[PDB]
Design a protein around this ligand. Sequence first.
Ligand SMILES: Nc1ncnc2c1ncn2[C@@H]1O[C@H](COP(=O)(O)OP(=O)(O)OP(=O)(O)O)[C@@H](O)[C@H]1O
Ligand SMILES: Nc1ncnc2c1ncn2[C@@H]1O[C@H](COP(=O)(O)OP(=O)(O)O)[C@@H](O)[C@H]1O
Ligand SMILES: Nc1ncnc2c1ncn2[C@@H]1O[C@H](COP(=O)(O)OP(=O)(O)O)[C@@H](O)[C@H]1O
Ligand SMILES: [Mg+2]
Lengths: 74, 74, 509, 50, 50, 456, 456, 177
Amino acid sequence: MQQLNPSEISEIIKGRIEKLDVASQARNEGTIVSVSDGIVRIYGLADVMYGEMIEFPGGVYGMALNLEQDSVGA
Amino acid sequence: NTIVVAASASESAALQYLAPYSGCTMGEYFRDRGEDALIVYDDLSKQAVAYRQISLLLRRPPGREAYPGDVFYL
Amino acid sequence: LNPSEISEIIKGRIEKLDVASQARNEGTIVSVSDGIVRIYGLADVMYGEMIEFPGGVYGMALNLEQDSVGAVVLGEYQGLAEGMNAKCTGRILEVPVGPELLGRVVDALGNPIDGKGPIDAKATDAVEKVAPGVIWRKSVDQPVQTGYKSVDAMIPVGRGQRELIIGDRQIGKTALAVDAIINQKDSGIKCVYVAIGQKQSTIANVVRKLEENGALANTIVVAASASESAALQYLAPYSGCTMGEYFRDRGEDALIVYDDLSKQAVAYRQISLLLRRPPGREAYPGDVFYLHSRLLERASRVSEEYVEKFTNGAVTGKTGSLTALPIIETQAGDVSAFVPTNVISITDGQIFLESAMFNSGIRPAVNAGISVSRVGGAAQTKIIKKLSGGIRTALAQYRELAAFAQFASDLDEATRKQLEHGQRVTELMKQKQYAPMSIAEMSLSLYAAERGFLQDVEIAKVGSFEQALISYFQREHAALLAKINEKGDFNDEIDAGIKAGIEKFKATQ
Amino acid sequence: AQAEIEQELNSVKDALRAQVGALAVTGAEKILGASIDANAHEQLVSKLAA
Amino acid sequence: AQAEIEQELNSVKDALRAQVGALAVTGAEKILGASIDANAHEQLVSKLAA
Amino acid sequence: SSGRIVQIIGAVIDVEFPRDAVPSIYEALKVQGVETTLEVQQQLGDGVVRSIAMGSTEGLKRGLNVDSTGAAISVPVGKATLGRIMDVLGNPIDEAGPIGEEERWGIHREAPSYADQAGGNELLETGIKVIDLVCPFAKGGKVGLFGGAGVGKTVNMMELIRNIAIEHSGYSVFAGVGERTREGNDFYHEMKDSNVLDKVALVYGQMNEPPGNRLRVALTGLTMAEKFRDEGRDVLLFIDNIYRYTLAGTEVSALLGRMPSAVGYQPTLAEEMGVLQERITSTKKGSITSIQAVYVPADDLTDPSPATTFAHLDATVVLSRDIASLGIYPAVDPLDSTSRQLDPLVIGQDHYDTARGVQYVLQRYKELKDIIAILGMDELSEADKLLVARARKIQRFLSQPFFVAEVFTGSPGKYVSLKDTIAGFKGILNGDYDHLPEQAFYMVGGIEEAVEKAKK
Amino acid sequence: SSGRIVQIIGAVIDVEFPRDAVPSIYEALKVQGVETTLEVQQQLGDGVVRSIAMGSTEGLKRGLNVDSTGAAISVPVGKATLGRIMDVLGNPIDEAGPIGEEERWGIHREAPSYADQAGGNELLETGIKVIDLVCPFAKGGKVGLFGGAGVGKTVNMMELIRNIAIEHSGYSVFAGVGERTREGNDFYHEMKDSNVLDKVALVYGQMNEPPGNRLRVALTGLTMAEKFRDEGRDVLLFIDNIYRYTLAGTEVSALLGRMPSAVGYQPTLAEEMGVLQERITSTKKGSITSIQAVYVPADDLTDPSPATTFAHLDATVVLSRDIASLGIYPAVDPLDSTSRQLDPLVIGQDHYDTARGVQYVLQRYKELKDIIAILGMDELSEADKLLVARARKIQRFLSQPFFVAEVFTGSPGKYVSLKDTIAGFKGILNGDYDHLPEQAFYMVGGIEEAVEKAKK
Amino acid sequence: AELTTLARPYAKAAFEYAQAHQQLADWSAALGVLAAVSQDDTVRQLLKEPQLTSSAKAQSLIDVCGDKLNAPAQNFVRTVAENKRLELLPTIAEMYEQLKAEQEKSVEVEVTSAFTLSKEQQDKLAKALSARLSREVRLHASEDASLIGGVIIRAGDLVIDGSVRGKLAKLAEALKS
Ligand SMILES: Nc1ncnc2c1ncn2[C@@H]1O[C@H](COP(=O)(O)OP(=O)(O)OP(=O)(O)O)[C@@H](O)[C@H]1O
Ligand SMILES: Nc1ncnc2c1ncn2[C@@H]1O[C@H](COP(=O)(O)OP(=O)(O)O)[C@@H](O)[C@H]1O
Ligand SMILES: Nc1ncnc2c1ncn2[C@@H]1O[C@H](COP(=O)(O)OP(=O)(O)O)[C@@H](O)[C@H]1O
Ligand SMILES: [Mg+2]
């Protein structure tokens, strides 16, 4: 049994119970799922390119480096 | 007076791993019938390298120099 | 011999037994592999708690995960199986403590293995504890006599010091530590001997030698042989330390020997690799320094305020102490290895035993060039402290000139006299096993060499001269030896008394 | 001393057979605070048959 | 030698107290004679004890 | 709103909080009944945070309630901390009652900016011949004492504390990080008996302590030194062992779910050093002069921890087991030791040429080691024989009896000025002492004492 | 109840059982309709157990039924095992029919307890002069045997097997750990031709067998030796190569996926050696003494395998190629061989002085031989020339005719008591036999026989 | 990983939605039927075929349940199938009941006795357990002739043993010492 992927969170799962539609969130936006050691894992952000700049609340900027199937590691 | 068994560098690692056993089997034909035979394995190190490749691709646990636990048994 | 009114004690057991029901917190074994067990349930289990399994087996909780508990088995794990019951005990890992352990041989959990019946200990204490802080300690200034001329003169040990014994295999490491325990039988210091990874036959021979020399009644023996579970080998030092701390906290003095801390490190590496923890240098765990440093920090001298606070005022105006003699084995004499270097960074000095000296017939084998005591100079007794200053330098002059003995008959007067004195001090420092010397006996040997009374004695007779001189003072000057043995004091009257006796000895015996 | 206890062991091993019944009955009335009246009637067969 | 003789005796006394005497755990046979009336008393006792 | 403990593995604890009340990184948490303090390190998602305990975890269980304090670990600062002993959390541990602080500061802070950096090369005399010669120190700079086990890092640091306190009138901070508890007691009573204690702030997190304490105690001591620096003072910061801060990170890294790097070290090794080391610096407001002992694992100077530390220091003093085995103390290696202050524009051409001349002779003697071991000195050229004799005198003249080491030998300590240091080595290099025996230079304070010792 | 094979990966087989019928660790399992036996190594949960096959897994398939035997691998024990060859499972591998055992014992058990230790240290008299004098064996001890090939290793084992059986009423067991089939066959015929086969039980774990077979053969031979010990006897256990036991553990540990230790050895290296070696001891009923051949990887005595093995050895016998060239048998080196019982407190002052006396003369002769070879015999003094004469007599008196070597030596075999051995060497050292020629001491049982041989 | 560690997010999401919309009863029936259906031997085999896409596995399971799944519960099955976790359904239902039981302040208790216990005795035990657990207890009585008398209670990891079998073991442990 694979370990729990980064997007298998109660809030992400509950959001899909109410609406399965992916387009209900703009492909230009996402939400922080985890913050560890300078690495942030995001759920969403479907139109992101490798190396593209991410704007976080507060003036902080990040960069996409791991465009995975369910999350984006920045 | 010689049987030549070949498993070249471009052949599948399975054939390179099996070639010594095939040649040994052809040599044993004479031993079991009351005759004498001589066999040359030009590189037992290359047979071990082929078996290590198969073992790592099959995800078997590695040991010293990345060889599998049964390399002595081989 | 066997009255029926004694075997009737069963009625007393039945009268004292309480059959009332009690709530237990439980779980079930899920998997079993190489001494590690996974358990489902046990919601009230604490980190470090003892877990109870059928057949009297115990485990220790080390992984409290959200959905399961990971435990290390404290003994033979092959009898455990999936579906067996596991119960919380409500107790952190503990062992029995007190004077009732003196003269007994026990396993790492405190169970008796000598066959002499149960242990009637009235108290227990936690195996894992943090050592007392900076303000609660006191400087080391009381001596611990090992009974060896070379060690007590050049590498003095004080009450509350940690002194490492280090060297290659089969060169007297055990002999030096066991002889130090034997010499404490009349000193008031209680002893603990912890055998980690040793052969059962070796442990049995050490216990036989402790009773043949009258030291067993003053010693607690903790054993974790070469075939016992790695969990018990890793835990044995902390059990022995806890039994030794019982005396320290109550304003008394104790001595502990860890027969092989390098075997404890090998046992901890096994558990860590079986738990798949990432290894470092020489494949040891990242916390291998914390393993020994946490153990050796407990050996200390605690102040009167600590003893008064700990005993709730029952013991007043007395300091308490725990002295430690850890042992380390080095491969091919290499002191630069990872585990030896870690323990040198923890202890207050070390005694290095040299393989070349041991094979050359110098059995004590103490390498004076590198051996040193960081806090023993303040602890050494007045007589030995004043006479030992010239011993250390004389051996240095010998090490620098020893190879020249084949041509030294053709050298300058100064170098010839320095070499001739170094040879006599080297010969004098030899001593047999199980033959400890008192302060007065060591003082005669040191005085004869420091004051030049050996210059006209040939090397082949320095040992004969020493045994004859000590025997002579024992009959002609018994009152002077009795005076020196009280507290090792050295006044003008004692100095005059010793030279008068040695001069009469040289002139008549 | 080993020979002295061998002799005695045999005597006392037979003496103990008279006590196991009272020990077992004390155990039965310890488990539950009742039936001490009923146990006295079955005791005669039970002591031996246990 | 005298301490070793006392250790032998106490090992025999304990082995007798463990082999024989402890045989009284056969008090289960006495207890096997219990019925529904006694069970009700044990359920009340258990209930009073949570 | 409080959270609950969901997992416990060694020093690392996972706590679950409501999605709208998750604590920030570095925030301090407290277990309700036990009062154990935890520092948040990572946000795992779904309301769970991973933290390190600032104390023993024995006896803790799953399901215990945890309160968040709303801020990072904060410690007392200023004049109230002088002459007192504190733990990692800032509690008094000297039994002398509560601390009277006017304010508390969080232990996590950003390093001073590029524009705040102070430039300076003012020479600091140590009174130690080898240090004043080949690796001179500067006021407001950083010094590292590199060495294996038992070679002398503490004895040398205690002699430097004794000698630098002669010309320094300001405050001092001593941080005991992962070292012997006995050494802390010895130093405390020595300063208390000498009446020097009221000028020093003491912070201790020794070997007996859990991983969380040994990982943050260096920040607590540094936070006190930063208050004095920012008040416009000149302060001395001594660190008992900087390697222990790195090792505590290695002990906990696997539990934090990180992949191991070379030789099992944490992947964040260089960043963990940089975040600490950049704060230990002098600024336009005030200065921090710092001396740090650096442990070397298994005597290997190429090990990732010592190797990453060299780049953070102004002066590097390397101690050697080979030199210590010959009975030469302080045991500094003159070929491996170095300082940025060894510049003609800072120390002048006379000192610079003398230090260069000493290194040239010692390097040439080192190259002859194998030839001398197999064939002896007699097969060398007349020029090599003269150089070997001077190299042997230079090695012995670098030795010095220390005041703190008087207990180990009874020999009185010696203080040597830079003037006397340069004059002695220059005379030996020029051949003014070619007639003296090499044993005359061993354990002599000044060149005059070598001349007197040669007459015996 | 039976289980089913659920997974097969080389020699590792996973079997699924009903939740209430899961087999115990080390329990032996039988595959239905095939002769394959499996040993349970780990319990994975959900009723699944991981096991190692005791033979080839070729032709096995998922879903085959597996039966639990209720106990560990059980082997035949007692007199019925003498003169027969068996595999790891105790099956006869010779064509001599079924073994007539009356009892079977499981191969796994705890070592004798602290209270079972025999106590006093007693010597095992081998009847061989060089061994009994220079490297005495203690009852219940472990002896390391070193040397090359073609130096008399088999002949020494056959002589020890003869002497324990005929002179001490004991028995022998041979455990062929990683045995070569050609050499195993040759050894069986050499023992039959030497009439020693009926005095020893043979267990072979051949090189072509899976890792589990090679690992367990030592325990099978040891279990057979434990039965003979409990009959009130002194037993000899021969282990063909203790290094191959260590390697079989490394192979099995790698198959089971355990994380490797330093130098790639299994993490359980010291514990696996301890479990084997701690059963070989002297108990209150009888004793098992063991002779083990030792291989040193890359000639490195500090390698984990030799270093872990040496902690358990009580004596070391070194066979020499040079001594065999001189026609001296057995070819044992009196200067390289060692013994922990060669101590005056263990063997007494008379035996110790005699043994040390022989070693001193032989050591000094080794040095004088180099002087004679480089400068000539005329450089030596009359005292040195007398010492050379005594050294030659001592060196020849160490030689001995063996009952199993009568084919090679022609002369009848001799058993020499320890009393006769000490008296003979003491007399030669004291010069009591200086009038006899050196050739009189070659191939003679005792000093008396040398006096009689000198008249011919 | 433990099946419980993987089913926790899904069980928690289904419980929060069911609670927020007052559908706690409906989801207990939906999850229960999905759990039972996913374990039948033809469905157990269909949910392991290599040619079916995640959407076809979800649709097949939705068509079998039919009317026993509201629109939200169908979105949940499609989510569990898309994330490749349809083997967790029995554990998701089990964990959903634990969250629901603690929300309703109820506890499930297992009881074993030597002989059948009457309703008066069951209520007498339930009363005491409810008082210490401060929850609405639901007893599940059962028979076990292994005990020679008394009862054994178990509520989660709490175990209260009042059986004479346990008392006979304590007596043995106290005499074997
Ligand atoms: N002072 C001594 N005089 C004579 N012999 C000694 C002396 N000290 C030790 N020995 C002898 O040295 C040998 C080895 O000693 P010991 O067993 O203590 O060494 P060790 O290093 O502890 O061995 P090990 O590594 O096996 O534990 C023994 O024969 C012992 O009797
Ligand atoms: N001048 C000196 N004389 C004697 N010993 C010295 C001298 N300098 C250093 N040492 C040695 O230094 C050691 C202490 O330093 P070290 O162990 O490196 O420091 P730390 O206490 O930080 O571990 C002691 O063994 C001490 O004997
Ligand atoms: N006692 C002996 N007397 C004479 N020759 C011997 C003796 N011991 C060994 N040899 C010679 O050494 C040869 C090889 O001995 P062996 O025990 O088989 O050594 P290995 O097994 O190492 O090959 C024998 O065949 C014999 O020729
Ligand atoms: Mg030892």
